[PDB]
Structures are given as C-alpha cells and as structure tokens.
C-alpha cells in the first residue's frame, strides 16, 4: 500500500481491452449519453471470408457506422486507470484497435457544408465603421489623479518632527531584529519626517553602503 505502487492484476490476469478511435462530433454526441449513459447497440457479423462490426446510435442519442479494424502490432497497448479515490489499476491489454468511418451516407460537398457549420466562430474580421466614433471626451479631474488625492489627504507618510526621546525607542527596537535595514524602510517604520530621522541617526550611528547601491544605516556599538 503506497502511492507509487502499481497494481499489476490486469496484466497478470492477461486482461484484454479494445481500443476504438472515434470522431469528435460523435464524441460530442456521446458526451450527451442517453439517460445515465446508454448510446446504442454494436452489431458484430463474422463470416468465412469477412467480418463486420458496426455501432448504431441510441434512438435518444440520435436526437450505420462501419468499423475499420487497425493493427496493434509493433506496439503493445494496455489500459491503466486512476480512480476518483486516486487508486491505480491496470484493467487490461489491448487486443483490438478500430476506426469509425462514414459509408455511402455522405460525399465531399456536404461534408464541407458540415465543416462550415462546425466553423461557428470564423477567425474574426476587420469590420467597416460608419463615419467616425468619438475619441476625445471632456473630463475635468483625471480619474487616476482623484484617487491619489484621497490617499495623500487621508494619511501623511511622514508626520511630526517631534518627541526625540520617544522616537529613539521606536528606532532601537527595529535594530534588535536586524543588523541591517535599507534607509527607506527606516523612514517607513517610524513616521518621523526625513530630516529629523537623519539627525537622530547621524547622532546615534553611521551609514554603510557595503558597495551594493542600497545603503543601510548601522548603529555604533560603541
């Protein structure tokens, strides 16, 4: 019992399966399986000199397909499953392959008419406009500009240049977490305006680039 464990039962049972190629339009008819899922009857007629298999649509599904048998030689084919419970199972080995083809029921002209019907969405086209559509409106305050205004008025990023003692504590605390912070965050974490921050910082520490563009200030341990 393991995820990567493959059941070999089917193979070891020599379980056989059949493989059939089916057109999409038929397969689209099949996604509409009649009732819970019944699509019709398959007729298998074998004779001494010939063998005929075909499938007939469910009367419900309808609202002769001859089979062409294909060789499975050159490549061994087996069927393996994945349950909705994600359990894995090998159902069988493919003992037959076949293709459903039209026969005496359609010719190329109406097949092309059916292809045009399938088209449905033609690749789009360049349409012809009448006169000219309006391009320039009369807005007073650009919408983007009006949105920034409320943010700046509601909240000021840098506030009072005041309470030097109070600020230091806020400042010392950040340092505990990290020996190095870039300047802007330092400005962001406190709300103190840039000049006071510089003077407090210049007073209590030194600033080092470390030769990587971004310079983060570091306190003097002394």
């Amino acid at each position: 019992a393991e995820r990567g464990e493959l059941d070999l039962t089917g193979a070891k049972q020599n379980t056989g399966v059949w493989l059939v190629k089916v057109p999409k339009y038929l397969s689209q008819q099949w996604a509409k399986a009649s009732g819970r899922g019944e699509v019709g009857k398959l007729r298998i007629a074998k004779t001494q000199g010939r063998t005929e298999v075909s499938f007939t649509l469910n009367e419900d599904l309808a609202n002769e397909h001859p089979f062409v048998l294909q060789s499975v030689g050159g490549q061994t084919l087996t069927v393996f499953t994945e349950s909705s419970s994600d359990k894995l199972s090998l159902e069988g080995i493919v003992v037959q392959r076949a293709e459903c083809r039209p026969a005496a029921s359609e010719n190329y002209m109406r097949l092309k008419r059916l292809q045009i019907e399938e088209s449905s969405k033609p690749v789009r086209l360049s349409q012809q406009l009448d006169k000219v559509v309006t391009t320039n409106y009369k807005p007073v305050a650009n919408h983007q500009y009006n949105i920034e205004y409320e943010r700046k008025k509601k909240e000021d990023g840098k506030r009072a240049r005041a309470d030097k003692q109070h600020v230091l504590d806020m400042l010392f605390s950040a340092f505990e977490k990290h020996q190095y912070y870039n300047l802007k965050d330092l400005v962001d974490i406190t709300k103190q305006p840039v000049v006071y921050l510089k003077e407090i910082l210049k007073e209590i520490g030194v600033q080092n680039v470390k030769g990587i563009h971004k310079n983060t200030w570091e306190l003097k341990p002394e």
């Binding site: 789009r124 406009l129 919408h143 920034e148």
Partner: protein
C-alpha cells in the same frame, strides 16, 4: 491584409499581466471607418481622393479597438471593465479597394467627383504624391534544397527556411552539411566524410547523431530508421557508418544537451542553465513550421531524418541537385504580405511602451488609466514614413532597411501607368556581374514577359508579368487536412517505420503529415474535387512525382498561376454550348466564374506545370495520326498571352529581330499622348 491579417496580429498577442494587486489588459476586436479629415477647428468630414492630391493631404482611415481591463488583487472580488472602440492610429488606404470612398460607384458618380472612370486604382496617396508598391521576389520557404558549394569545406549542403504560419518576425534557417572527401589527413582518410549540422543560435558545428539524441532516441537502431527507410541498401548504410564513430562516446541525453548547450549566445557557467538553454533552442528555434509546442517531438525527428535521407541521395547520385533560379522555387511579396510584416514591428513596439508607462505609474500605487498610455503617433507616422521614402525599416533605422520599394507612379502615358502596377523585382544587387540571375529561364513561359526589360545596369533584374498571369492570395490548410485523414491516410505517430518503403509520403504546405498506399486514386479524387469547387478552392496546386514517390500540396500566398483548358481523352471539354451562352453575358449573368465552376478551365501553377502535357492549339495538335503524343492533358487558349503590356502593342512582333522588341517596350513608355 486588412480583413484577416490585421485582426490576427492583435488577437494573437500576449496579455500584459503586471504588478499587491495586479492588472489585466487584452485586445478583442478591430474596427475601421471611412477616410476622414479633421478640419482646423476639429469638425470631421470625409475626404475625397481629389482634395488629397490638391491640398497635399494623406488618404488614410482611423483605427479602433476594444480593450478589457480586469484587476486581480484577490480582494474578494475580480473587478473587470472594458473600453470599447479605443483610438489607435491611422492606416493608409489603397484606392478603389473595398474600404475606399470610390468602391462600387457608377460612371455618373465617378465623373461627379472629378475622377476618371478609366483610372485603374491600386496606389496610395501620401502627402499629395501617388505611391505604388513593387512586388519583391523571395526564395520559397518550408522546403528542402540541395546545393553544392565548390569553394568551401562542404561537399554538399541542405537548407530549410521555416516560419510558423505568419507569426514570427525572423525565419530560422538550418543547414545540414557534409564535409569534403579530400581532407588531407592520415586519420579521417579511412572513415570518410561526416555529416554535420549548423543549428541557429549556436557558435559551433554539431554532429547530427548528437542532436538526434537530444530529442531522445539514444539507441542506434532507432536513429537509423528515421534516416534510412529500407535496410536492404548496403550502399547508403556504409555512408552513414562514419557518422556514428565520432558521436560514440557521448551516449546519453543529458550530456548531449550539455554539449550543444555549452556553445550558445551565452556560455553557461552552471549545468542546469545549459540543459535549460539547450532545451528551448532545440524546441522553439529548430524547424518551427512542423510544430512549436514542447510536445509532438517525434515529428521534428522524422523531418530531420528526411532532410538527411535526401542529402545522401544527392551524394550517391540518385537525384539531381536543386536549381536556384527555377521559377517554381520563388514567391512574391505583394502589398499584403509587406504591410503585415511592417505592422507587427509597430504593434509590439506599441505594447512595449504601455508597460514602461504602467510600471512608472503603478509603483506609486495610485491607479491606472489607459487612454493616456497609448502613443497614437507610433502606427500613424510609422507606416506613412516608410511608404513615402521607400526604405523598408524604421526612422532611426535608415541604414538597416531594404531600399527601392514604394516609388512614384509614372503618369507619362496611359500604357506607362498600367506597366507600372504590374512589375516584379529581384532583390539581388544592381551591379553584380553574375549572369545566371539575369538570363532568361525556361520556366518563365507564360508568366513573365520575355521581351520587356530595361537596358543599362538593371538588365533582367526588373521584369513585368504576362497578361493572364494571376498571383495567389492564400488560404488555410484546415479543410484539406480534415478530408485527408478520412480518406485512409495513416498519421506519422501510429505507424511502423518498416511500412514506409512502398508508400508515398504526403506533404501539405511543407509539413510531412502522413503516408498513403494507393496514391493514383487519391490524386484523381483530389482533382475532381477542385474542378467543381466543393472543399478545395481553385488556387491550390497539387504535385505528384511518380519517381521520387511523394505528393505535395500548397495553399500559401505568392505562387503564380495562369489558366489553361482541360482536355479529356483527346477532345476539349469546351463544347459549343458554352460559347453561344457566353456571348450573352450582358443579360444572362453567365461569366468567367460560371466557367471555372463547371470544370472546363483550371489554374496551373509553375511546379504543377512540370507534370503536365500541353497542346498549343486544338484543331492542329489533337488529331489522331502518326502523332507526336497522345496523352495531352491541357491546351492553351491563345499563345499570344505570353507577352506583357508594353510588348503587346507591336504589330507582327514575330517578324522582327529579338533585341528590337526589347527597345520598343522600353520606348513606348515615354511617348506623348
């Protein structure tokens, strides 16, 4: 170019997802309006083609689009919005088209706007002037050509220029060489020549077995069945043997990818990047016309095998080399495939600068507004520039462009106007002394005028096309592929490489798409469908060569055609019933189109013209006797339609010496009238 080729360019463009929240932008539908002029005070009015000439205006039409914008911040709501009919730019308009103001007018109205009812149309009006676009020649793409450079290290060479259905600015080309025999050395004297390949985006040559293993197929029984299709041939297997000896030590996939991945545009310092770098270059730059998806890599193996199988046949002397000037290997670039190429490089350039305006504007986190992001002067001044001046490039790119396109219409005499709108141009140099691109080739029969050409330094470089010659416009290979699969054509994947010796490989538009085992019944089934126009349009060509055992089909734009008369057992298919009802088109509504759709005439390309047997005149060549041939397949209409426009005004031209007919055709273009 303006109904399909412009809608596809904006539709098949990557969205610009960008960013915290992130935003969406994608384009849906394109519109156009009739050409319009904006007055001095901003009141629009339709401009007629005459005022464009008098006031030195430009004849163009505005361009709109629908854009939808969704914001994705997972803020418990996906807010989408759209701005439809957004202005983009202005496109010039060719006169008398379906988008001009003169489309479908009667002579009583054409004279009322001061226009000539005899004017042909087909030119632009740009700053008062009248510009005309010259069709440029170009080597055909998506096919294999085998040459022999008798100066360099190679004893043979193959080529294949690939482009994935009008979607790539460049076209990746790949060689498959073979080194020379007389290599002075006491080492390779015994083994022989080694097949080499020169992939794109890499510096060094690569052996072919290495690049084969990089796709899987490490075994040498599986490689040597993509390249040799029958193992009863010892003469060919001996030639491929010394190709394995040098690729013997490197015998697994990942080390192979490292070998090719080691020499690129960037030498990989680490290992995983090289194995990554070698993955896409061998996946999106190798043969993009077969398939560009990372799946379906068994097809890139077969085609690369066919490319090599065909290089050996040229060394054993079993098939002749390809011809460079054979006019069946050429394509023509009209105004369509020329303006579409120039519109890609300016739509990408318009999206590249919505980002630069969005990022600068979204880092501050304010908001976004798109009507201010679109720089409208990109498309307007982009097209109008290169058309007016000729250099087929950009303004800051007045040194990297192809010049000589888009010259001024000649209005000296009415037959000098018509002989200008019908003119080709081969883009080789104007002073090279090589005669083979200048001499007259057998394949120009009926498609390029043989007598009309200028003297001086441009002899045989510009040419005019014959009277009934017709250039194709292009179509999609979708409806033929869906018919081929249901007519018993085995795909490439679901088949064994031993069932390939007695089958006729079926190509479509350059791509190998299967095989077949009964071709002669497929062929005369493909043909009788085209004769009456059910599934296949009339401008596709279908070649079958019995000896090389394959079948080709073409649907692209640029091939040159001309109509002929279809001949059954020994009699024409044009009975008298077709004539006595064709002399009545005035009040019967029976015309040329009802003649093609009845299967009595047929357009015949140049390639297809090598598998045909023509008769020059019915009453004289289709009489049973001790006869030249007895299996005539087509017949000409009148052999006088092999002359151009300026050379078909000469009386009795079959009585003069040949250089005389060339002088007059270049001299009736400057006669006053």
């Amino acid at each position: 170019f303006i109904q399909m080729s412009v809608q596809r360019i904006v539709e098949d463009a990557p969205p610009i997802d960008l960013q915290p929240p992130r935003y969406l932008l994608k384009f849906e539908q394109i519109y156009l309006s009739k050409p319009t002029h904006w007055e001095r005070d901003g009141a629009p009015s339709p401009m007629m083609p005459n005022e464009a000439r008098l006031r030195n205006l430009t004849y163009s039409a505005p361009l709109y689009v629908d854009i939808t914008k969704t914001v994705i911040k997972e803020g418990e709501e996906q807010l989408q919005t759209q701005h439809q009919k957004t202005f983009i730019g202005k496109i010039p308009i060719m006169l008398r088209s379906t988008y001009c103001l003169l489309n479908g007018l009667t002579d009583r109205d054409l004279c009322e706007l001061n226009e000539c009812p005899l004017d042909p149309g087909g030119y632009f009006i740009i700053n008062g002037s009248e510009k005309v676009l010259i069709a440029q020649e170009k080597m055909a793409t998506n096919t294999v050509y085998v040459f022999a450079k008798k100066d360099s290290k190679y004893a043979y060479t193959g080529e294949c220029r690939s482009c994935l259905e009008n979607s790539s600015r460049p076209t990746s080309t790949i060689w498959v060489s073979m080194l020379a025999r007389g290599g002075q050395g006491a080492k390779k004297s015994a083994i022989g020549q080694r097949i080499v390949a020169t992939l794109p985006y890499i510096k060094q040559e690569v052996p072919i077995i290495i690049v084969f293993r990089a796709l899987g197929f490490v075994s040498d029984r599986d490689i040597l069945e993509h390249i040799i299709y029958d193992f009863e041939d010892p003469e060919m297997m001996e030639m491929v043997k010394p190709s394995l000896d040098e690729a013997f030590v490197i015998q697994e996939q990942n080390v192979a990818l490292n070998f090719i991945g080691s020499r690129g545009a960037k030498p990989g310092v680490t290992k995983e990047k090289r194995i990554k770098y070698a993955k896409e270059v061998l996946q999106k730059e190798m043969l993009p016309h077969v398939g560009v998806s990372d799946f379906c890599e068994t097809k890139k193996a077969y085609f690369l095998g066919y490319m090599v199988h065909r290089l050996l046949l040229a060394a054993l002397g079993r098939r002749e080399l390809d011809d460079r000037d054979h006019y069946g290997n050429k394509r023509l670039d009209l105004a369509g495939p020329l303006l579409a190429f120039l519109f890609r490089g300016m739509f990408k350039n318009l999206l590249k600068e919505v980002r630069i305006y969005a990022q600068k504007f979204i880092d501050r986190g304010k908001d976004f507004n798109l009507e201010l992001a679109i720089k409208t002067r990109i498309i307007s001044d982009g097209l109008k520039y290169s058309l007016a001046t000729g250099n087929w490039g950009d303004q800051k790119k007045a040194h990297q462009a192809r010049a000589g396109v888009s010259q001024v219409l000649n209005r000296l005499t009415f037959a000098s106007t018509l002989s200008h709108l019908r003119r080709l141009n081969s883009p080789i140099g104007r002073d090279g002394k090589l005669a083979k691109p200048r001499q007259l080739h057998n394949t120009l029969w009926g498609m390029v005028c043989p007598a009309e050409t200028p003297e001086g330094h441009a002899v045989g470089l510009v040419k005019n096309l014959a009277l009934m010659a017709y250039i194709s416009v292009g179509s999609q290979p979708s409806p033929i592929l869906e018919f081929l699969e249901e007519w018993s054509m085995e795909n490439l994947e679901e088949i064994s490489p031993a069932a390939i010796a007695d089958a006729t490989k079926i190509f479509v538009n350059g791509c190998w798409v299967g095989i077949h085992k009964d071709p002669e019944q497929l062929m005369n089934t493909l043909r009788k469908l085209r004769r009456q126009m059910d599934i296949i349009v009339s401008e596709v060509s279908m070649i079958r060569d019995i000896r090389e055992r394959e079948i080709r089909i073409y649907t692209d734009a640029g091939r040159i055609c001309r109509p002929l008369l279809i001949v059954e057992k020994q009699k024409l298919l044009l009975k008298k019933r077709h004539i006595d009802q064709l002399k009545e088109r005035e009040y019967n509504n029976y015309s040329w189109q009802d003649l093609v759709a009845s299967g009595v005439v047929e357009y015949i390309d140049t390639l297809e013209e090598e598998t045909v047997m023509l008769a020059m005149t019915p009453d004289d060549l289709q009489e049973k006797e001790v006869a030249y041939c007895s299996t005539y397949t087509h017949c000409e209409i009148h052999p006088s339609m092999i002359l151009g426009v300026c050379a078909s005004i000469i009386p009795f031209p079959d009585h003069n010496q040949s250089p005389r007919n060339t002088y007059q055709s270049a001299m009736g273009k400057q006669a006053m009238g």
